[PDB]
Amino acid sequence: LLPDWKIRKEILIEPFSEESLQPAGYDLRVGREAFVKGKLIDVEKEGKVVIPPREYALILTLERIKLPDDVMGDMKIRSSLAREGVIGSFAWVDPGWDGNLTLMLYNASNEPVELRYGERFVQIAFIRLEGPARNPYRGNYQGSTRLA
Amino acid sequence: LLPDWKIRKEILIEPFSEESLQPAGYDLRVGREAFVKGKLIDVEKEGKVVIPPREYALILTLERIKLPDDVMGDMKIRSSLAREGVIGSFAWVDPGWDGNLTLMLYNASNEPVELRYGERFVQIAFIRLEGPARNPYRGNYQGSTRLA
Amino acid sequence: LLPDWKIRKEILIEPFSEESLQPAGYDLRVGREAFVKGKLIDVEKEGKVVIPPREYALILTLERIKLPDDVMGDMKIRSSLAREGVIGSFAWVDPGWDGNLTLMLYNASNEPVELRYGERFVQIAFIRLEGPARNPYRGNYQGSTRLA
Ligand SMILES: O=c1ccn([C@H]2C[C@H](O)[C@@H](COP(=O)(O)O)O2)c(=O)[nH]1
Ligand SMILES: O=c1ccn([C@H]2C[C@H](O)[C@@H](COP(=O)(O)O)O2)c(=O)[nH]1
Ligand SMILES: O=c1ccn([C@H]2C[C@H](O)[C@@H](COP(=O)(O)O)O2)c(=O)[nH]1
Numbered sequence: 001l002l003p004d005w006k007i008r009k010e011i012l013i014e015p016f017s018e019e020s021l022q023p024a025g026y027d028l029r030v031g032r033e034a035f036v037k038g039k040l041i042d043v044e045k046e047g048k049v050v051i052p053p054r055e056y057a058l059i060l061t062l063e064r065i066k067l068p069d070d071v072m073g074d075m076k077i078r079s080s081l082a083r084e085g086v087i088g089s090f091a092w093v094d095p096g097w098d099g100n101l102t103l104m105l106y107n108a109s110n111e112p113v114e115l116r117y118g119e120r121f122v123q124i125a126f127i128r129l130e131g132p133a134r135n136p137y138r139g140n141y142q143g144s145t146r147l148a
Numbered sequence: 149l150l151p152d153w154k155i156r157k158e159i160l161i162e163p164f165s166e167e168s169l170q171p172a173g174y175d176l177r178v179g180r181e182a183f184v185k186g187k188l189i190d191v192e193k194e195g196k197v198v199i200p201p202r203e204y205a206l207i208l209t210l211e212r213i214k215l216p217d218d219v220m221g222d223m224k225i226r227s228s229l230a231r232e233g234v235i236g237s238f239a240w241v242d243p244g245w246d247g248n249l250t251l252m253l254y255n256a257s258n259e260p261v262e263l264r265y266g267e268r269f270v271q272i273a274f275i276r277l278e279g280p281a282r283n284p285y286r287g288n289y290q291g292s293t294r295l296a
Numbered sequence: 297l298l299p300d301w302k303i304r305k306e307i308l309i310e311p312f313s314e315e316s317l318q319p320a321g322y323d324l325r326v327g328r329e330a331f332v333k334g335k336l337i338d339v340e341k342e343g344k345v346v347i348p349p350r351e352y353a354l355i356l357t358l359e360r361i362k363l364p365d366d367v368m369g370d371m372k373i374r375s376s377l378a379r380e381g382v383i384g385s386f387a388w389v390d391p392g393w394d395g396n397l398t399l400m401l402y403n404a405s406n407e408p409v410e411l412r413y414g415e416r417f418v419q420i421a422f423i424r425l426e427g428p429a430r431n432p433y434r435g436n437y438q439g440s441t442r443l444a
Binding site: 054056058069070072074087089090091092094095096102104106127128129130131132133134135136137140147148 | 149150151152153154169170171172173202222224225226227229230231233234235236256257271273275276
Binding site for chain 2: 297298299300301302317318319320321350370372373374375377378379381382383384404405419421423424
């Protein structure tokens with residue numbers, strides 16, 4: 001697992017925010033795109049993304065994450081959102097990945113959960129593989145937008 | 149964390165599917181058993197398992213996973229399902245585990261989520277322990293069926 | 297990742313329960329505080345905490361977890377709860393953390409999920425950082441109570 005000072009040197013995080021740097025992870029921020037109730041949302045334009053109660057939202061990360069072939073992305077919801085009743089349905093960030101992440105966030109609470117554009121909401125930890133993956137990732141690769 | 153080429157040599161995955169092999173994990177597939185709305189389902193016979201909207205399903209993995217005493221199973225939903233609004237409630241795969249996994253998948257969306265028999269739905273990563281666990285797992289062990 | 301025998305020597309777990317020790321993790325137990333339906337609950341006094349169907353609860357862990365600057369806390373719901381339809385919305389346990397954890401647990405089932413005071417419900421795994429985090433955690437730090 002990469003500590004904070006090693007995250008700067010191993011993972012390409014654009015744009016990078018020093019405040020998003022955690023002791024052993026990086027706080028991914030809300031990007032320009034979102035998907036709530038079957039509608040695409042321009043979080044960059046609208047400025048926010050509101051996850052209605054008991055609804056899930058596909059949120060595009062502001063950061064474009066590029067993982068080396070020997071690093072795995074382990075994402076967890078920011079504790080703030082968890083304490084708000086928000087559940088994150090995160091998959092692995094395969095070694096070699098490159099592009100903005102489409103993160104599923106479910107508002108299990110009865111109050112709407114508002115997420116400002118560029119606000120930190122998911123801390124991604126980076127676990128180093130024992131060796132570079134024989135076959136780096138090649139699926140939703142190079143995604144710069146919300147991918148379904 | 150075991151890369152793809154090391155997963156072949158350290159973890160017993162039966163049946164094994166080369167397509168389920170990920171850069172740093174293995175895509176567990178839907179097995180023969182499932183549990184939705186208080187009913188047992190024969191996904192092998194019925195061929196599919198449908199998680200109704202806002203309902204959770206206990207799904208038996210097609211693969212029988214046997215973990216060495218120094219490897220921990222880290223499971224995450226397949227991004228495809230996450231983008232569908234499906235949330236996985238996965239526990240740790242203790243070092244030493246052996247048997248098919250009962251995976252809780254919650255359909256947080258408003259559309260039914262269909263999972264074919266043998267379809268990949270959960271990628272399990274394998275983290276190597278600093279040393280073999282003093283007491284390997286002995287609880288729902290050797291489970292070859294859905295375990296409640 | 298710390299095996300069971302290394303968890304005793306690296307992580308400060310108070311109070312510690314040998315039964316909560318897993319092959320590669322520790323089963324965190326339900327503490328004295330809980331938060332369900334906008335109300336604070338005295339699980340120590342009341343003895344239990346009931347997560348109503350389709351509701352989430354903020355549960356304070358009985359154990360006060362103190363992580364070294366080079367260890368990350370990876371929490372997952374206990375398989376028992378997962379098989380019950382309970383989903384855990386857990387964030388990272390930053391290296392250096394010290395204090396009781398506020399764990400979000402969502403009852404996705406249609407039956408109430410009862411959690412006795414001191415009952416194990418979340419197994420926390422400990423991943424060692426490649427090096428001590430440059431900036432250990434300093435946010436909801438030293439939390440001995442439910443923190444929102
Ligand atoms: O919530 C997620 C999780 C992963 N990814 C990215 C990183 C991965 O390379 C890929 C998902 O494939 P898996 O690693 O989950 O198999 O897409 C996302 O965009 N959103
Ligand atoms: O979603 C899961 C997670 C784990 N297991 C298996 C592997 C573990 O050995 C055991 C669960 O015990 P814990 O590791 O969660 O404590 O059952 C499952 O069947 N389904
Ligand atoms: O579910 C959780 C997860 C984490 N923490 C603690 C440990 C962390 O130090 C901090 C949350 O900050 P992050 O690590 O999630 O960024 O609070 C909790 O109390 N509950």
